[PDB]
Amino acid sequence: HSLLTEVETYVLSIVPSGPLKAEIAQRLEDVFAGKNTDLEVLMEWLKTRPILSPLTKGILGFVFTLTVPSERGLQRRRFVQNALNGNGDPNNMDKAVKLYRKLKREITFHGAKEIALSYSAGALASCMGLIYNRMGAVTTEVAFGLVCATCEQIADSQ
Amino acid sequence: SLLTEVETYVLSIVPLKAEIAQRWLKTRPILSPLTKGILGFVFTLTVPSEQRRRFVQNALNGNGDPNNMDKAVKLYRKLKREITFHGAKEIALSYSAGALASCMGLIYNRMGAVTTEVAFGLVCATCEQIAD
């Protein structure tokens, strides 16, 4: 019943603001409906938004890179990589690698999200970083699963 | 003297250059990639008092590589139980540049994790590995 829409709800659940929620929702939905979209425009826009924590930008950046055709432009942006590089925390990095290996064996959104839902926001974000480094390591659905668990954990944290 | 070979090690990777570390202040812009993080990591050991974490935190990442991160964390644990220069450097030598670099990012965030000597070993082991 549409994973894109589920992913959007999870993404928006970590966007504080109110005005940004609407702005993010519009962009995700345009992307979903194939409407006029351009990845460089989205990223630049995302990068310059106020209020959104670096982490949220990393997550939205990852989701746009995953959902936006507009590639053939070997992406990998600084702000996305930095916000998802973990943060010098050994424990989150160790867990991120362990989750990452489990996700490579998953093939569905549901299986990926359930496994990832037990991990901490920190390791989930580091894990998103590993996958950002090579989006093909897992399937799109699995990547979506991970994004959603990450959002749940950030939302449930504070 | 330890700051001597560390200084040559620190300049073991540099691309003409102009030394900068003689033994406070700030940045250094213009060019210089990963080395920037390394150098910065160095300064953070030879410039503050008895903060920032600019491009230090970014260059000393694991570059989205699963194996480097994996290794970097296992090295990190070891370098914590280590206590001398050469020893830490010895061990760090059995790991790759990527791993070594990722290990430096960890140490950074919590410098107090490893002694200045050990960290220096990591540095040299890293540069030696890099330059090589």
How would you explain this protein's 3D organization?
The structure is a homodimer. By secondary structure, the first copy, chain A, is mainly α. Chain A folds into two domains: about 1-80, Influenza matrix M1, N-terminal subdomain 1 (Influenza Virus Matrix Protein, Chain A, domain 1, Up-down Bundle); about 80-155, Orthogonal Bundle (Arc Repressor Mutant, subunit A), CATH 1.10.10.180. Helices cover about 65% and strands about 0% of the residues of chain A. The first copy, chain A, has nine helices and no strands. Chain A has helices spanning about 5-10, 20-30, 40-50, 55-65, 80-85, 90-105, 110-115, 120-130, 140-155. In chain A, helix 6 packs across helix 8 and helix 8 packs antiparallel against helix 9. Chain A is globular. The interface of A and B includes residues 88, 90, 129 and 130 of A.
Give the proportion of residues in helices of chain A.
55-70%
| Largest beta-sheet characterization of chain A | none
Q: Please give the domain count of chain A.
A: 2
The CATH architecture of the largest domain in chain A comes to: Up-down Bundle
Outline of chain A: globular
Looking at CATH, the homologous superfamily of the largest domain in chain A is Influenza matrix M1, N-terminal subdomain 1
**CATH class division of the largest domain in chain A:** Mainly Alpha
Compressed to H and E, one letter per element, the order of chain A equals HHHHHHHHH
What is the tally of helical segments of chain A? 9
| CATH-defined fold name of the largest domain in chain A | Influenza Virus Matrix Protein, Chain A, domain 1
Strand count of chain A:
0
For this entry, what is the oligomeric state of its chains? homodimer
Distance between the termini of chain A: 29 Å
Structural class of chain A: mainly alpha
Largest interface: A-B, 22 and 19 residues
CA-atom Rg of chain A in angstroms: 14 Å
- The share of residues in extended strands of chain A comes to under 5%
Family (chain B): Belongs to the influenza viruses Matrix protein M1 family.
GO molecular function (chain B): RNA binding; structural constituent of virion
Subcellular location (chain B): Virion membrane; Host nucleus
Main location (chain B): virion
